Structures are given as C-alpha cells and as structure tokens.
Design an enzyme around this catalytic site. Structure first.
Site, PDB file in Angstrom:
ATOM      1  N   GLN A   1       7.061   5.834  -0.195  1.00 50.80           N
ATOM      2  CA  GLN A   1       6.876   4.539  -0.828  1.00 50.80           C
ATOM      3  C   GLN A   1       6.385   4.660  -2.276  1.00 50.80           C
ATOM      4  O   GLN A   1       7.056   4.210  -3.197  1.00 50.80           O
ATOM      5  CB  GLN A   1       5.885   3.721  -0.010  1.00 50.80           C
ATOM      6  CG  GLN A   1       5.922   2.246  -0.299  1.00 50.80           C
ATOM      7  CD  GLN A   1       4.739   1.540   0.310  1.00 50.80           C
ATOM      8  OE1 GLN A   1       4.283   1.909   1.389  1.00 50.80           O
ATOM      9  NE2 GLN A   1       4.239   0.518  -0.370  1.00 50.80           N
TER      10      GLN A   1
ATOM     11  N   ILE B   1       9.911   1.214   8.808  1.00 49.92           N
ATOM     12  CA  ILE B   1       9.188   0.453   7.789  1.00 49.92           C
ATOM     13  C   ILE B   1       8.848  -0.991   8.146  1.00 49.92           C
ATOM     14  O   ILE B   1       9.721  -1.763   8.531  1.00 49.92           O
ATOM     15  CB  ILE B   1       9.993   0.411   6.450  1.00 49.92           C
ATOM     16  CG1 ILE B   1      10.189   1.822   5.883  1.00 49.92           C
ATOM     17  CG2 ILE B   1       9.277  -0.477   5.436  1.00 49.92           C
ATOM     18  CD1 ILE B   1      11.244   1.872   4.784  1.00 49.92           C
TER      19      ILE B   1
ATOM     20  N   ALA C   1       3.215  -6.708   6.177  1.00 54.54           N
ATOM     21  CA  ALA C   1       2.883  -8.111   6.054  1.00 54.54           C
ATOM     22  C   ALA C   1       1.442  -8.109   5.582  1.00 54.54           C
ATOM     23  O   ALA C   1       0.642  -7.290   6.029  1.00 54.54           O
ATOM     24  CB  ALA C   1       3.010  -8.815   7.397  1.00 54.54           C
TER      25      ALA C   1
ATOM     26  N   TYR D   1      -0.302 -10.704  16.239  1.00 52.32           N
ATOM     27  CA  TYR D   1       0.914 -10.116  15.677  1.00 52.32           C
ATOM     28  C   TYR D   1       1.581 -11.139  14.743  1.00 52.32           C
ATOM     29  O   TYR D   1       2.301 -10.781  13.796  1.00 52.32           O
ATOM     30  CB  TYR D   1       1.881  -9.744  16.795  1.00 52.32           C
ATOM     31  CG  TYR D   1       2.922  -8.737  16.381  1.00 52.32           C
ATOM     32  CD1 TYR D   1       4.278  -9.009  16.537  1.00 52.32           C
ATOM     33  CD2 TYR D   1       2.554  -7.483  15.886  1.00 52.32           C
ATOM     34  CE1 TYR D   1       5.245  -8.057  16.220  1.00 52.32           C
ATOM     35  CE2 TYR D   1       3.516  -6.522  15.564  1.00 52.32           C
ATOM     36  CZ  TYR D   1       4.856  -6.819  15.735  1.00 52.32           C
ATOM     37  OH  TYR D   1       5.816  -5.890  15.427  1.00 52.32           O
TER      38      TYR D   1
ATOM     39  N   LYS E   1      10.233  -9.122  13.410  1.00 55.08           N
ATOM     40  CA  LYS E   1      10.849  -8.202  14.355  1.00 55.08           C
ATOM     41  C   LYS E   1      12.030  -8.833  15.111  1.00 55.08           C
ATOM     42  O   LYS E   1      12.994  -8.142  15.464  1.00 55.08           O
ATOM     43  CB  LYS E   1       9.786  -7.674  15.334  1.00 55.08           C
ATOM     44  CG  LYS E   1       8.713  -6.792  14.677  1.00 55.08           C
ATOM     45  CD  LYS E   1       9.359  -5.589  13.990  1.00 55.08           C
ATOM     46  CE  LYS E   1       8.329  -4.585  13.482  1.00 55.08           C
ATOM     47  NZ  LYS E   1       9.003  -3.334  12.998  1.00 55.08           N
TER      48      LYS E   1
ATOM     49  N   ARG F   1      -1.441   4.646  18.375  1.00 53.87           N
ATOM     50  CA  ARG F   1      -2.455   4.683  17.329  1.00 53.87           C
ATOM     51  C   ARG F   1      -1.901   5.368  16.082  1.00 53.87           C
ATOM     52  O   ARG F   1      -2.070   6.573  15.903  1.00 53.87           O
ATOM     53  CB  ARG F   1      -3.712   5.425  17.809  1.00 53.87           C
ATOM     54  CG  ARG F   1      -4.888   5.333  16.833  1.00 53.87           C
ATOM     55  CD  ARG F   1      -6.112   6.165  17.249  1.00 53.87           C
ATOM     56  NE  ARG F   1      -6.886   5.583  18.345  1.00 53.87           N
ATOM     57  CZ  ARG F   1      -6.556   5.665  19.631  1.00 53.87           C
ATOM     58  NH1 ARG F   1      -5.455   6.313  20.004  1.00 53.87           N
ATOM     59  NH2 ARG F   1      -7.331   5.105  20.553  1.00 53.87           N
TER      60      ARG F   1
HETATM   61  N1  LIG Z   1       2.366   1.530  15.807  1.00 52.73           N
HETATM   62  C1  LIG Z   1       2.997   0.932  16.846  1.00 52.73           C
HETATM   63  O1  LIG Z   1       2.357   0.800  17.974  1.00 52.73           O
HETATM   64  C2  LIG Z   1       4.330   0.438  16.715  1.00 52.73           C
HETATM   65  C3  LIG Z   1       4.965  -0.190  17.836  1.00 52.73           C
HETATM   66  C4  LIG Z   1       6.301  -0.669  17.653  1.00 52.73           C
HETATM   67  C5  LIG Z   1       6.971  -0.518  16.403  1.00 52.73           C
HETATM   68  N2  LIG Z   1       6.337   0.089  15.342  1.00 52.73           N
HETATM   69  C6  LIG Z   1       7.004   0.237  14.136  1.00 52.73           C
HETATM   70  O2  LIG Z   1       7.068   1.484  13.729  1.00 52.73           O
HETATM   71  C7  LIG Z   1       7.305   1.450  12.389  1.00 52.73           C
HETATM   72  C8  LIG Z   1       6.364   2.307  11.692  1.00 52.73           C
HETATM   73  O3  LIG Z   1       5.130   1.894  11.783  1.00 52.73           O
HETATM   74  P1  LIG Z   1       4.033   3.059  11.997  1.00 52.73           P
HETATM   75  O4  LIG Z   1       3.327   2.689  13.374  1.00 52.73           O
HETATM   76  O5  LIG Z   1       4.620   4.550  12.109  1.00 52.73           O
HETATM   77  O6  LIG Z   1       2.904   2.940  10.831  1.00 52.73           O
HETATM   78  P2  LIG Z   1       2.910   3.928   9.528  1.00 52.73           P
HETATM   79  O7  LIG Z   1       1.651   3.474   8.648  1.00 52.73           O
HETATM   80  O8  LIG Z   1       2.642   5.416  10.029  1.00 52.73           O
HETATM   81  O9  LIG Z   1       4.218   3.926   8.593  1.00 52.73           O
HETATM   82  C9  LIG Z   1       4.530   2.742   8.096  1.00 52.73           C
HETATM   83  C10 LIG Z   1       5.347   2.928   6.927  1.00 52.73           C
HETATM   84  O10 LIG Z   1       5.768   1.814   6.294  1.00 52.73           O
HETATM   85  C11 LIG Z   1       6.068   2.251   5.066  1.00 52.73           C
HETATM   86  N3  LIG Z   1       6.301   1.223   4.162  1.00 52.73           N
HETATM   87  C12 LIG Z   1       5.623   0.024   4.080  1.00 52.73           C
HETATM   88  N4  LIG Z   1       6.130  -0.743   3.056  1.00 52.73           N
HETATM   89  C13 LIG Z   1       7.128   0.000   2.513  1.00 52.73           C
HETATM   90  C14 LIG Z   1       7.977  -0.289   1.437  1.00 52.73           C
HETATM   91  N5  LIG Z   1       7.894  -1.458   0.769  1.00 52.73           N
HETATM   92  N6  LIG Z   1       8.912   0.662   1.089  1.00 52.73           N
HETATM   93  C15 LIG Z   1       9.012   1.871   1.767  1.00 52.73           C
HETATM   94  N7  LIG Z   1       8.170   2.148   2.825  1.00 52.73           N
HETATM   95  C16 LIG Z   1       7.235   1.210   3.173  1.00 52.73           C
HETATM   96  C17 LIG Z   1       4.864   2.910   4.776  1.00 52.73           C
HETATM   97  O11 LIG Z   1       4.788   3.506   3.618  1.00 52.73           O
HETATM   98  C18 LIG Z   1       4.696   3.709   5.903  1.00 52.73           C
HETATM   99  O12 LIG Z   1       5.226   4.903   5.835  1.00 52.73           O
HETATM  100  C19 LIG Z   1       7.290   0.026  12.036  1.00 52.73           C
HETATM  101  O13 LIG Z   1       8.488  -0.515  12.021  1.00 52.73           O
HETATM  102  C20 LIG Z   1       6.460  -0.472  13.046  1.00 52.73           C
HETATM  103  O14 LIG Z   1       6.350  -1.771  13.187  1.00 52.73           O
HETATM  104  C21 LIG Z   1       5.033   0.572  15.483  1.00 52.73           C
HETATM  105  O1  LIG Z   2       4.657  -3.401  14.525  1.00 55.83           O
HETATM  106  C1  LIG Z   2       3.514  -2.870  15.013  1.00 55.83           C
HETATM  107  C2  LIG Z   2       3.141  -3.106  16.379  1.00 55.83           C
HETATM  108  C3  LIG Z   2       1.927  -2.531  16.849  1.00 55.83           C
HETATM  109 CL1  LIG Z   2       1.472  -2.835  18.499  1.00 55.83          CL
HETATM  110  C4  LIG Z   2       1.053  -1.734  16.056  1.00 55.83           C
HETATM  111  C5  LIG Z   2       1.439  -1.511  14.706  1.00 55.83           C
HETATM  112  C6  LIG Z   2       2.658  -2.082  14.203  1.00 55.83           C
HETATM  113  O2  LIG Z   2       3.034  -1.885  12.894  1.00 55.83           O
HETATM  114  C7  LIG Z   2       2.632  -2.636  11.792  1.00 55.83           C
HETATM  115  C8  LIG Z   2       1.934  -3.897  11.891  1.00 55.83           C
HETATM  116  C9  LIG Z   2       1.547  -4.622  10.735  1.00 55.83           C
HETATM  117  C10 LIG Z   2       1.864  -4.079   9.445  1.00 55.83           C
HETATM  118 CL2  LIG Z   2       1.410  -4.943   8.047  1.00 55.83          CL
HETATM  119  C11 LIG Z   2       2.560  -2.825   9.311  1.00 55.83           C
HETATM  120  C12 LIG Z   2       2.935  -2.123  10.486  1.00 55.83           C
HETATM  121 CL3  LIG Z   2       3.784  -0.610  10.282  1.00 55.83          CL
END
Ligand SMILES: NC(=O)c1ccc[n+]([C@@H]2O[C@H](COP(=O)([O-])OP(=O)(O)OC[C@H]3O[C@@H](n4cnc5c(N)ncnc54)[C@H](O)[C@@H]3O)[C@@H](O)[C@H]2O)c1
Ligand SMILES: Oc1cc(Cl)ccc1Oc1ccc(Cl)cc1Cl
Ligand SMILES: NC(=O)c1ccc[n+]([C@@H]2O[C@H](COP(=O)([O-])OP(=O)(O)OC[C@H]3O[C@@H](n4cnc5c(N)ncnc54)[C@H](O)[C@@H]3O)[C@@H](O)[C@H]2O)c1
Ligand SMILES: Oc1cc(Cl)ccc1Oc1ccc(Cl)cc1Cl
EC number: 1.3.1.9
Lengths: 257, 257
Positions: B39, B91, B94, B155, B162, B192
């Site tokens: 990013q 990615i 919010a 959420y 989503k 986590r």
């Molecule tokens: N953590 C969960 O429990 C969970 C569950 C379901 C889906 N997801 C999804 O997984 C994906 C990744 O989230 P994560 O849990 O690995 O957190 P993460 O913090 O490890 O990675 C999130 C990424 O978003 C990138 N990002 C945000 N804005 C950006 C932009 N404008 N341009 C380029 N990159 C950008 C960040 O730099 C970062 O790498 C998301 O789509 C998220 O919603 C996560």
């Molecule tokens: O989608 C998600 C769902 C869960 Cl249960 C936990 C983390 C998640 O991921 C995000 C939630 C809010 C923002 Cl601002 C950015 C990201 Cl990557």
C-alpha cells in the site's frame, strides 16, 4: 382497510407506470394517509397530480443525492406528520453507460460510486434522518431485483448495488428492531416502466421472463403494490429483514424449457 | 506442487499475521511464482523481506484507491510478467467511526463510499487494468466474510461492502468466464490478523466462534491459504463465481449450547 390509521411516505413516483404508483395506489385503497416526494421541478407537477387523486396534499421535494435535501424534506414533513409509520424507498440510478455490454469493461469507479450511493446508501440515509419521527410498529420498505443474487447481462453495476441494498435491509432491520421498526424489501420481477428502458434489450427480456415463469406471466405494479401494502401493515409484524420475491416464482425454477 | 508454472500476484501482505501471507506461503509451497505489492512505503520494507523468503524479487507499490496507481503497478509488472495467471485480492478498509456501535447511527455517506470503493470496486478495477495480461486458465480470488449474508454487530457498513463484493465475484466470473478466467471468493471465519483488532470487540467474537463451530476451533491463515492455493490452481478448473465458506462450518449451525 388493514392499513387505516397509518401514515406512509411514498417516494419514486414518476408516472402511472412507476412501481411506486402501484404501491401508493394499493395502500390508499387499504386506508393509508399518503405523503409523496418528487426528485425535481420536472416531476413536481405530475406528483401533485397523482397526490391529489389519492387525497394527499403533502408533496415535498427530495433528492437522495443531497443529505441536506433529505434533512429539509423531513424537517418539512414534520410540520404535518410529527410522527408517521415508515416510508417506501423506490429509487435507483446509474449512468446508462454502466448498463451496456461487458460488465468489466463498462463499470467505472465513478459509475460504481453513483450506483451504490443513490441505490443503496439513500435507503439508510433516509432512515437515519427520520429515526426519531417513526412510531413504534413502523415499517420501511425498498425494491430490489434478482440481479443482486445472480449475475444478469447488462444489469451490471446495479446488481452489486442491489446486493448492497439487501444487506442494508438486514443491517437496518437488525439495528432498528428493538425500537419497533421493521425493514423489508420486495425483489420484484421485470416490469415495463420508464427507467426499465435503460437496460439494453429489455423488451425481449420481459418476454423471456414469461414463458419460463411458473405462473406463466410477469408481475404488475398491482402485484407488487398488494405485497408492499402487506409488508408495511401490522399484519406482517413477524417479518423483518426479509427479501420476499414477487416474480411469480421465476427465481425458484431452472431450465424451464 | 499443483501450482507449478503459475505467476500469481498477491496483495494485502502487511505482516505475517496477514491472511494474504498464509496464502502466499501455501502457493509458493506448491511451486507457484509469486509477485508482491504494498500500500505505502511504510510497509515496503517488510514486504520486501517476506518477498525474499518466498523467492520473489518483485515488490510493487499499489494503492487501489487510485486508478493511476493500479495502472503503474501493472505497467511495472508487465516488464517482468508480460503475462501471468491471476492475483489474490486481500484488501479491505473503512474508517473506524463506521465499525463501532449502532449501524444506522454510525453509517455516513462518506464512510459508505470509501468502504464500497476500497473493499469491492478495487477488485474489478484491478481486473480491468490487467485483463489483457491474463493467460487462459487464469484465476482471481478475493476474501469475503459472513457479514455479507447476515447482520453482524459492529461490522456495519463493511457488511454492505462485502455483499457488494460477492455479487462482484459473480458478475466478473460471468463476464470473463469465456476468456478462460475464473473468479471465486473465500469467506473466512474470524482470524486474529493485523486489522482484526480494528473491529469493536473481536477477541470476544473469536472466543465465541471456536465454541459454536462444528470443528470446535477457529480457522488459521494456513487453512485459508490451502483453500486459496486450490482455488487458484487448475485443480479447481470446474469452480467459478462461487463463495466458499472456510470458517469451520460456523455459518451452517445455530443455537449450540
Ligand atoms: N481477519 C478476518 O477474520 C477476516 C475474515 C474474513 C475476511 N477477511 C478479509 O481478509 C482480507 C484481509 O484482511 P486481513 O485480515 O488479512 O487484515 P490485514 O491488516 O493483514 O491486511 C489488510 C490489507 O489491506 C490492505 N489495504 C488496505 N487499504 C488498501 C489500499 N487502499 N490499497 C492497497 N492495499 C490496502 C492493507 O494494506 C493490508 O495489507 C480482507 O478482505 C478482509 O476483510 C478477514
Ligand atoms: O472483514 C473482516 C472480518 C473480520 Cl471478522 C475481522 C477483520 C476483517 O477485516 C477488516 C475489517 C475492517 C477494516 Cl477497516 C479492514 C479489514 Cl481488513
Ligand atoms: N421496473 C422493474 O422491473 C423493477 C424490477 C425490480 C426492482 N425495481 C426497482 O423499483 C424501483 C423503482 O423503479 P421503477 O421501475 O418504478 O422506475 P421509475 O422510473 O418509475 O422510478 C424511479 C424513480 O427513481 C427516482 N429517482 C432516481 N434518482 C433519484 C434521486 N437521486 N433522488 C430521488 N429520486 C430519484 C426517480 O425520480 C424515479 O421516480 C427501483 O428500485 C427499481 O430498481 C424495478
Ligand atoms: O432495478 C431494475 C430492474 C429491472 Cl429488471 C428493470 C428496471 C430496474 O430499475 C432501474 C434500472 C436502471 C436504472 Cl438506471 C434505474 C432503474 Cl429505476
């Protein structure tokens, strides 16, 4: 009428072919007091015309694109309806170029934003603004389409906004329920309206959704109207956050010749 | 490995806790050639280190908030990978003032826009920029969450985002399907991660799941990586426009105690 004593705000009426017109018509028949809104000066006159036929003299201007337009509209309704019982959200928009040919090529960042803003955010923008004005037992309703569940040609970006709309319905329904407010949407089938001419080749699209449709006919604004009147009445007190299909079973069937 | 002879671009790697890391780790294990993007310069460093461990010296700066940024990235990549076979979309974003408290109250037009823009449109924007660089048999993958199917506390607006994301996967797979490109998504359970701590009360929502989930434990980035690896290999040449639940079976249960 199972709707007597209720005060409902109806938006999106643009012609006698408008789904909202079918909704207002059905609710009035069931005893509801209506209030209408028009997007701009081009529509005002006609909205007042229909507003009169339905014993209503409350015609307010309201463009969902402007938060201020929405605050001024409700600040006005408040002078005659300190409190009402929900509203019907029948509004959608997206530039024409978004609904033509390949989805990946047509869709643009700008078109995407407009479609989601006007077609899915406006629904909650309005709920937030009139929140304290709603009486317990109020009901909010919006109109969606199958394109939110399946990928349909030329519908493109709208499909994603509609998907967002239905999710909005569930989050709104969940947050406002403890206050006594229900939120549902009707996912109507193809209906020849004004904007209905937007999607490319829609004339032959409605012909397809007839022969393959279980009841062997597309729905009318009357069908949607009766269902909308039911979902906004106390008779549907146990239904909230639901997306009821009113397409004559078109979606629950597959490969019907 | 079943991914040998494949060039895949991986986005979202911000730390070893990133789901995207678990995904790159499994693909590389399967003999897939990877590329990486970051990013902002604040992350360039780590990404270069992780990239070096996975036998990759291709680390590009990419901010999906900007059309030009996506253009430059695919321009730079085109120098080394004139053609590749897909990318992983990890990615989401919010502003915090949207992910805490009552939905109708927190949601703002601005918050709504950014969410839908960065977490949903970004996925199809990336596909527009590299559509001509994709080999037949290419596969695109994104990450979704159950919040798009059900109203989940805090959420909020992301849920609408989503949902917009999942319909996007359906429209993309239907438009690019004839070119030999498949588009899928994984709906992961709570993990986590680095951004997970951003949701209002998460470590609490994590403990809950690992108790009501069929497999009696929350998923890990490896579990998600392995499914990701499979969804991008020719081994799943028969799946497209699908949203596979990788959450231990949580979504399919109810009232467990
Ligand atoms: N953590 C969960 O429990 C969970 C569950 C379901 C889906 N997801 C999804 O997984 C994906 C990744 O989230 P994560 O849990 O690995 O957190 P993460 O913090 O490890 O990675 C999130 C990424 O978003 C990138 N990002 C945000 N804005 C950006 C932009 N404008 N341009 C380029 N990159 C950008 C960040 O730099 C970062 O790498 C998301 O789509 C998220 O919603 C996560
Ligand atoms: O989608 C998600 C769902 C869960 Cl249960 C936990 C983390 C998640 O991921 C995000 C939630 C809010 C923002 Cl601002 C950015 C990201 Cl990557
Ligand atoms: N026509 C169908 O077959 C069909 C099927 C499913 C769902 N719907 C939905 O029904 C609803 C109504 O569509 P319709 O078929 O009655 O077409 P319509 O042309 O009769 O009415 C559409 C309305 O949108 C209003 N509108 C557009 N932008 C607005 C804005 N920025 N602010 C305020 N109002 C705005 C218009 O002014 C107009 O009244 C939409 O949600 C639509 O997508 C229609
Ligand atoms: O949602 C709809 C679904 C169908 Cl089958 C037919 C018309 C619909 O409504 C619209 C489609 C595109 C634009 Cl720009 C505006 C509106 Cl009101």
């Amino acid at each position: 009428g199972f709707l007597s004593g209720k005060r409902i705000l109806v938006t999106g009426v643009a012609s006698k072919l408008s789904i909202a017109y079918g909704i207002a018509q059905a609710m009035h028949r069931e005893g509801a007091e209506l209030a209408f809104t028009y997007q701009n000066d081009k529509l005002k006159g006609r909205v007042e015309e229909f507003a009169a036929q339905l014993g209503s003299d409350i015609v307010l201007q309201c463009d969902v694109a402007e938060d201020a337009s929405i605050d001024t509209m409700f600040a006005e309704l408040g002078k005659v309806w300190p409190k009402f019982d929900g509203f019907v959200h029948s509004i959608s928009f997206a530039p024409g170029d978004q609904l033509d040919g390949d989805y990946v090529n047509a869709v643009t960042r700008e078109g995407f934003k407009i479609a989601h803003d006007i077609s899915s955010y406006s629904f909650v923008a309005m709920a937030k603004a009139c929140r304290s004005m709603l009486n317990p037992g109020s009901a909010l309703l919006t109109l969606s389409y199958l394109g939110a569940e399946r990928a349909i040609p030329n519908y493109n970006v709208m499909g994603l906004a509609k998907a967002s709309l239905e999710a909005n319905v569930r989050y709104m329904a969940n947050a406002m329920g403890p206050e006594g407010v229900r939120v549902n949407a009707i996912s109507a089938g193809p209906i020849r309206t004004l904007a209905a001419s937007g999607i490319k080749d829609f004339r032959k699209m409605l012909a397809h959704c007839e022969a393959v449709t279980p009841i062997r006919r597309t729905v009318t604004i009357e069908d949607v109207g009766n269902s909308a009147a039911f979902l906004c009445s106390d008779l549907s007190a146990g239904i909230s956050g639901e997306v009821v299909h009113v397409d004559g079973g078109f979606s629950i069937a597959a490969m019907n010749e």
